[PDB]
Each structure stands twice: as structure tokens, then as C-alpha cells.
Amino acid sequence: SKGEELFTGVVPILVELDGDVNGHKFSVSGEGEGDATYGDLTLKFISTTGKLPVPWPTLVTTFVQCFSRYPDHMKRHDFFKSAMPEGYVQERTIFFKDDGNYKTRAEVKFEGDTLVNRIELKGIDFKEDGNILGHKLEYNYNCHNVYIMADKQKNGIKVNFKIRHNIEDGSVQLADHYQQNTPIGDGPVLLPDNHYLSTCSALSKDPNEKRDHMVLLERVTAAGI
């Protein structure tokens, strides 16, 4: 399964994001590795242009579902890997309730032996003293099930889900996600039936790192079939 073979072992991952939110331009690089046999990955991100104008947690979803563990009985529903090595384009719109929104476009594919997620994010309509720009979110993250549905139209998948971010002293700030993924190559892909990705994420910090950074650790497993 060409694509599948690509993920038998541990694969290094590189993430490159260029962003602009309300005119606050910034860049982030991440490096790590993942092992789809188990569905685990670890990534370390560094804000390379200065202190991030948005809270780290808000960028988690943006920063590689091909690393999900798809159980054997579900192998025929693994679109993400089926598109590799040429890759896929992942696009999203994330609306922070009562706040601005992020629009992202990324490309995920192999470069050499590394799996790279190269992103362009543009956010607007945000509120300066808002939870976002004001950095009032706690530095934590939750676990969720994200439902995946095919999209014959785009020849890929559609997905929608909400992320709940905890507010320092408030409730939570909702971040409503709309996602589309389409193959990059012209070859055939796997269009799966409806299912979901069970996703565990947690955030950490690195004792030796002086720059603004985030350590993201996760375990993701496909299910629902």
C-alpha cells in the first residue's frame, strides 16, 4: 500500500507555519516524529519571530492526521496515507466564538524521508483585548473525537468539529473548525466511510528551551468502523 508503507516506522516530521493575525505577522517551525503504527507523535514548536501574538493552543489543530493509527479493519478508510507521498492540501476556517477567525491552507507531503506540513494562516476580525489576542487562554488542551466524512465532490474528505479552550478565569472559548482535505497527486485515493479519529493531545514545555515554544504530544486512533 505505497502510502501505507511510508508510515510503518517512525517518521520525522517538520511543520512550517507562516501567519498573520490582525496584521501581527509571525512564523513558527516545529520538528518531531510520529509513528502511525501506534498513532503517537511528538512535536516541538518554536516561535521564531518573537512572542506569538496568539496563544499556543489555538494553533494546535493547524500544526498531520496521516499519523493516526488506523486499525487493520479500517485500512481501506485511510485517506490521509493513501494520498502520500504526493500529499494532500488541508484547508480550514476556524471561528473563535465572539471573536475573529483563522483561515488556513496547508500542504502535507513527503520531502525526502520527512513528512512536512507547510502552512499559511490568515486571521482577522479579532478583538485586541479578546481572549485570543489578549492571551487569556489556559495552556492546556483537551481530547476529542473528530468525525471524518468523505467528499466525493472534492475527491477527499470533509470534517467539522469544535475545540473547547479554557479561559484563564472564564468559561471556555469555542473554536469551531471546518475542514476540507484534497489529494495533491492525480492518482487514486481512499474515500472512506464515515468514521472518527479519537484524539489525545497534551501540551508541555521544555526545561532547556529559552525561546517561546510549545511541546505537543499526542496519541490518535481511528475508530467508528
UniProtKB/Swiss-Prot annotation:
Q: Explain the purpose of this protein.
A: Energy-transfer acceptor. Its role is to transduce the blue chemiluminescence of the protein aequorin into green fluorescent light by energy transfer. Fluoresces in vivo upon receiving energy from the Ca(2+)-activated photoprotein aequorin.
Record note on what altering N194I does: In mut2.1; shifts fluorescence lifetime from 3.03 to 2.50 ns
Q: Which InterPro entries match?
A: GFP, GFP-related, Green_fluorescent_prot
According to the UniProt entry, where is the signal peptide? none
Q: What is this protein called?
A: Green fluorescent protein
Question: Mutating V159A: what's the consequence?
Answer: In GFPB; leads to enhanced fluorescence at 37 degrees Celsius
Per the UniProt entry, the effect of V146I is: In Azurite; shifts the excitation and emission spectra to shorter wavelengths and increases quantum yields compared to BFP
Gene that encodes the chain: GFP
User: What is known to happen upon mutating I124V?
Assistant: In EBFP2.0; shifts the excitation and emission spectra to shorter wavelengths and increases quantum yields compared to BFP
Outcome reported for the amino acid change (mutating D151V): In EBFP2.0; shifts the excitation and emission spectra to shorter wavelengths and increases quantum yields compared to BFP
Tissue expression per record: Photocytes.
**What's the family?**
Belongs to the GFP family.
Reported impact of H144D: In Cerulean; leads to improved quantum yield, a higher extinction coefficient and is 2.5-fold brighter than ECFP
Effect seen on changing N145K: Increases fluorescence at warmer temperatures such as 37 degrees Celsius. In Esmerald; leads to brighter fluorescence. In VisGreen; leads to brighter fluorescence
Question: Changing F95S: what effect?
Answer: In alphaGFP/cycle 3 GFP; improves folding at 37 degrees Celsius, reduces aggregation at high concentrations, and increases the diffusibility of the protein inside cells
Tell me the GO BP annotations in alphabetical order: bioluminescence; generation of precursor metabolites and energy
Does this UniProt record's set of keywords contain Nucleotide-binding? no
Q: How is it modified after translation?
A: Contains a chromophore consisting of modified amino acid residues. Maturation of the chromophore requires nothing other than molecular oxygen.
Effect ascribed to mutating I163V: In P9; increases fluorescence at 475 nm excitation. In R10-3; matures to the red-emitting state with excitation and emission maxima at 555 and 585 nm, respectively
Q: Which SUPFAM superfamilies match?
A: GFP-like
